[PDB]
Amino acid sequence: SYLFDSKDYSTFSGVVDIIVVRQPDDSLKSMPFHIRFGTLKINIQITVNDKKIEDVFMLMLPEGACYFPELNIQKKLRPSSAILKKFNLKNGYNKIQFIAESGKQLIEGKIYLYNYDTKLVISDVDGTVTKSEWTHDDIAELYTNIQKNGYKMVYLSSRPLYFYNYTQGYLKGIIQNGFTMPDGPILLSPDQIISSLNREVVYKKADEFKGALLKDLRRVFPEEVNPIFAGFGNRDTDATACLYAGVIIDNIFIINEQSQVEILGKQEKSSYKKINEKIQELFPRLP
Ligand SMILES: [Ca+2]
């Protein structure tokens, strides 16, 4: 908190976790790339899973945001399937690295590959994982068991970019009665990642930022699948975004100040503990 205030050498260097999805025709589609090279005034090379990607590169804009030069030359945050196929991604987590050649600066990141039939479970972070940092009791066990049954937890954050790396540590350092938070991408509300390449629509919203994020996530999947199975949040604005994103009302969970989880569709007040007891009824194992 007081580090940025005075150190001042903490502009964001890093990458926001990337999501890629294999379509049924074997093509690849990804969410927008958001990578920043801190205090750099250029080409960028990529290395995935400790393997350099030959003849693929990004450029940087004066403001610091990077993009893919792709001809129809348009500056693209979403690379083409041909670029993404050169990554040779594996299912689940992949290590990705970007090297800006000015000297040479390196940022490491995460890039996830899902199949079009993957079922995701969304979880807000502030107020949903954290308790207004204290964590709600028993969430790690629940989320762990949800992940065991075949779903992929996706975390949602609206914190400024300079807290992104911090946020990754907090989630990954949580321990409850031996359980930990399943690894998954932390998506960022588009209002926290503004740049010339994405001003167009983000600039013109208010509380639809979460909904815009959920639909940017929906659109890397084919329109004929409902990839978002369930949602965890703590404000009614979370439920509204889940509802407009196609999540059935029975799979929307909203926690309040005293850790009471309302299952909207059932008009049932519950808890992470009780929801975990019914994990197989509420989150049935996937084949
Ligand atoms: Ca919240």
Residue numbers in the entry: 10 to 50, 57 to 87, 92 to 121, 125 to 154, 167 to 321
From the manuscript:
Structure 5 was determined using a construct that retained the N-terminal helix but contained a D155N point mutant. This point mutant was originally designed for enzymatic assays to probe the role of D155 in catalysis and substrate recognition, as it was found to play a role in magnesium coordination in structures 3 and 4. This structure (Structure 5) was determined in the presence of calcium. Crystal packing involved interactions of the N-terminal helix with another molecule, with the N-terminal helix partially ordered in this structure. Overall, we concluded that Tt Pah2 coordinates magnesium using Asp155, in addition to other canonical residues in the HAD superfamily.
The remainder of the C-Lip adopts a Rossmann-fold, forming the haloacid dehalogenase-like (HAD-like) domain and harbors a conserved catalytic motif DxDxT, where the first Asp coordinates a Mg2+ ion that increases its nucleophilicity, and the second Asp participates in acid/base catalysis.
